[PDB]
Each structure stands twice: as structure tokens, then as C-alpha cells.
Design a protein around this ligand. Structure first.
Ligand SMILES: COc1ccc([C@@H]2C(C#N)=C(N)OC3=C2C(=O)C[C@@H](c2cccc4ccccc24)C3)cc1
Ligand SMILES: N[C@@H](CC(=O)O)C(=O)O
Ligand code: NA
Length: 389
């Protein structure tokens, strides 16, 4: 009798779950039909509108969250909160790349660094909102440039007392208002996910290695870390951020699923806005546990000496940090890990075909790390938030 109350309460949660079930069924059913590449794009259009909607809100979401969030905290507490984040991010990505290396043993590069330094320091803030540098400015928002600028701006506003308050208040209203619009987007999400995944399925031992490896990291490593740190049941936490994971599986972008990761953690998991505004936008771009595991697996897979296996763990953690929270950013950053060891970069072409499905899974682990990461930081920074009340 207690399942009718579950269906009433979890209406939206189960709808997107059904959207995956119906989407996989529809996609395989429509796959024998030849269609056209143009026709596939037409078919997947309801999934495209969901991407346009989510993408729309990331700019006001990142900028307003970091400016308010860092102004909300004292600069020394921001460093303490920050040290908790960076220490967590680096350990979890090192834990994943080591796990990744173990599983496989059982079964223009300078320009890349310069371009990244260039994006950390945008020469124009208006363009940074829709363009990124690529050696000379390719289309596509500079999330890293804005993340960095907002952090320095947020610290500055906190440091300027009351004169600062007006702009903190301005940006707080702008965050709550964009968060009110993601409530709307969420109802379209089941229709979008169905079409976004059905189109992608309308198109070996390696693919299984990552899939199993991400289950060990995602469902065993990360939860036991959260339990060991907070002493709270981690699988109930994962149930709250479920809509955010199912959307990561659909979009394959951790920057596009950030507004929904915000709605879940803030509400469903009841995490502090002060720390979600701090953790989640930074975690979206730099904390990529699932990508790190995939970088290591693929670098060793194409090879199919220990001091150069040491360079793989260093460059796979390096690529993990660099790679944008945008779909297919994984194999584009494989150039850094393939070059460092000495393997030919042209081998990336062998992976490309199956990569799409692995991307959806590694995005879920990249989001899951930020979700559990915020829960861990919130708990550790208990006193800092206690003081600001
Ligand atoms: C790759 O890009 C990043 C950017 C940020 C961060 C950390 C983070 C998270 N999560 C957030 N929200 O803020 C700060 C972080 C610090 O560790 C340092 C922290 C900080 C505290 C006090 C004064 C600062 C002055 C300048 C920059 C950061 C400062 C801010 C890590 C990597
Ligand atoms: N698409 C992934 C990044 C990657 O492809 O490595 C994400 O946004 O989490
Ligand atoms: Na990254």
C-alpha cells in the first residue's frame, strides 16, 4: 500500500527514469529506419530544446553563485572552505586514476597549456560569457574565466563591507530568480531526456573496463568516503541528487546539469546555499573523477616503464582538471596524456565511435563527486556556517 504514496511523491523522479526506459526502447525501434543525418537532428530536436534551456541558465547561475557565495564568507574562511574543496577534489581524482590504472593492468600540446592560462584571464568579460580562446577565439562560453573572475569579484565585495552589500543583494536576487526558472525547465526534462538519448542510440573490452570501474568508484569508493567523513547514509544522499544524475546521463555535460544539481542539493538533500554556491560551479569544471578514470583507462588501452606509468597518473589528473564540463571534452584532452607518455595522438579515432555512451557515464560520476563533495565540505565547515548566523 506504501508504493502509491511513493508514486504520488516521486512523480517527476520516476517520469525521467521512464523517459530513459522509453527513450532506449524508442531509439532501438527507430534505429533500423535509414532516415538522414539532418533527419536525426530533427528527431532529436525535443532533446535539443532541453539543452538550449539548461545552457541558457548556466551563465547567470555561475556568476551569481560565486559572487554572492564568496561575499557571504570572510576571506580567511573562504580559504579554509577552499582548502577543504581542493584537498577533496585532488584526492578523489587521484583515487580514481589509481583505480583506473589497476583495472586495465588486469584486463600543439604547449598551446593547450597556454590557451588554458589565457582562459583563466579573459581580456573581455562580455565575450567570456559566450566565447573561449583557442590558438583565435572559438565559440562557446568560458566557464573557467567567469568562475575565476566571479571568485576574485566575490572576495572583493566581501572585503568592501556595506558599499559591497548592494551588489551582493543585486546578485542574490539574480540567483534566486534563475533558480526559480530551473523549476520550470525540470518539467520539460522527462520529454527532453527521452529524445536526447533516443537520438544518440540512432547512430569492446575497453568499454566494459570503464563502465565497471565507474561503478566501483561511483557506487563503492565515493559513498564510503562520504560515510567515513559525515557518518550519514550516502545512498540516501544519492537518491536526492538522482534527477541531476539522470540528466547528466542524458545531456553528457556537467555544466548543463549544474542548475539541476543546484535544485537537488539545495532542496532534496538540504545542503547550505552558502557552500553549494562555493563547491558546485568549481566542481563542474575542475572536479572530474569519472573523466580521470577514463583518461587513465584509454591511455593504457591504446598501448595494447613504471616511471612513465607514473607520468600517466600525473597527466590523467592534469587532463581531468583541464577538460571542460562540456560533452566530448574527454577525448579532446587525451592529447595531453598520449603525448606525455609517447603514444601517437591519432589513435584517439579508434575510441570516438563508442565514446558517446562512456561520456554519459563519466559525466554522472563527475557530477556525483561535486554532489557528495558539497555534502562533505558542508559537514567539515560546520563552525564557519555556524558563525555566519
Ligand atoms: C581552478 O579554480 C579553482 C577556483 C577556486 C577554488 C576554490 C573554490 C572551490 N570549490 C572556491 N569556491 O573558492 C575558492 C577556492 C580556493 O581554494 C581559494 C579561495 C580563496 C580564498 C581567499 C582568498 C582568495 C583570493 C584569490 C583567489 C582565491 C581565494 C576561493 C579551487 C579551484
Ligand atoms: N562531458 C563530460 C566531460 C568529458 O567529456 O570528459 C562532463 O561534462 O562531465
Ligand atoms: Na576538468
Amino acid at each position: 500500500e506504501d508504493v502509491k504514496s511513493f508514486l504520488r511523491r516521486n512523480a517527476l523522479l520516476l517520469l525521467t527514469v521512464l523517459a530513459v526506459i522509453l527513450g532506449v526502447v524508442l531509439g532501438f525501434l527507430l534505429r533500423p529506419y535509414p532516415l538522414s543525418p539532418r533527419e536525426v537532428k530533427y528527431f532529436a530536436f525535443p532533446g535539443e530544446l532541453l539543452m538550449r534551456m539548461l545552457k541558457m541558465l548556466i551563465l547567470p547561475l555561475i556568476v551569481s553563485s560565486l559572487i554572492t557565495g564568496l561575499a557571504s564568507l570572510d576571506a580567511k574562511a573562504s580559504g579554509r572552505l577552499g582548502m577543504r574543496a581542493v584537498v577533496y577534489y585532488m584526492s578523489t581524482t587521484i583515487i580514481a586514476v589509481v583505480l583506473g590504472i589497476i583495472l586495465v593492468l588486469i584486463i600543439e600540446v604547449l598551446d593547450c597549456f597556454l590557451d588554458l592560462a589565457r582562459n583563466i584571464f579573459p581580456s573581455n568579460l562580455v565575450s567570456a560569457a559566450f566565447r573561449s580562446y583557442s590558438t583565435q577565439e572559438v565559440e562557446g562560453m568560458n566557464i573557467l574565466g567567469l568562475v575565476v573572475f566571479s571568485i576574485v569579484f566575490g572576495i572583493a565585495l566581501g572585503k568592501m563591507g556595506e558599499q559591497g552589500q548592494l551588489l551582493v543583494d543585486f546578485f542574490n536576487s539574480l540567483n534566486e530568480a534563475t533558480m526559480k526558472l530551473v523549476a520550470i525547465i525540470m518539467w520539460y526534462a522527462p520529454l527532453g531526456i527521452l529524445f536526447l538519448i533516443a537520438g544518440k542510440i540512432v547512430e569492446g573490452m575497453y568499454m566494459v573496463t570503464v563502465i565497471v570501474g565507474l561503478v566501483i568508484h561511483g557506487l563503492i569508493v565515493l559513498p564510503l568516503i562520504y560515510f567515513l567523513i559525515t557518518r550519514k547514509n550516502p545512498f540516501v544522499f544519492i537518491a536526492g541528487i538522482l534527477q541531476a544524475l539522470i540528466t547528466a546521463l542524458g545531456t553528457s555535460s556537467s555544466s548543463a546539469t549544474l542548475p539541476i544539481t543546484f535544485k537537488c542539493l539545495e532542496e532534496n538533500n538540504g545542503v547550505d546555499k552558502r557552500i553549494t554556491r562555493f563547491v558546485l560551479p568549481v566542481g563542474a569544471t575542475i572536479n572530474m573523477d569519472g573523466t580521470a578514470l577514463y583518461e587513465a583507462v584509454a591511455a593504457i588501452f591504446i598501448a595494447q616503464d613504471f616511471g612513465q606509468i607514473i607520468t600517466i597518473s600525473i597527466t590523467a589528473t592534469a587532463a581531468s582538471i583541464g577538460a571542460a564540463g562540456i560533452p566530448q571534452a574527454g577525448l579532446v584532452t587525451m592529447v595531453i596524456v598520449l603525448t606525455a607518455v609517447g603514444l601517437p595522438t591519432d589513435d584517439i579515432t579508434l575510441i570516438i565511435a563508442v565514446d558517446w555512451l562512456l561520456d554519459r557515464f563519466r559525466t554522472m560520476v563527475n557530477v556525483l563527486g561535486d554532489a557528495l563533495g558539497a555534502g562533505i565540505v558542508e559537514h567539515l565547515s560546520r563552525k564557519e556556517l555556524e558563525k555566519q548566523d
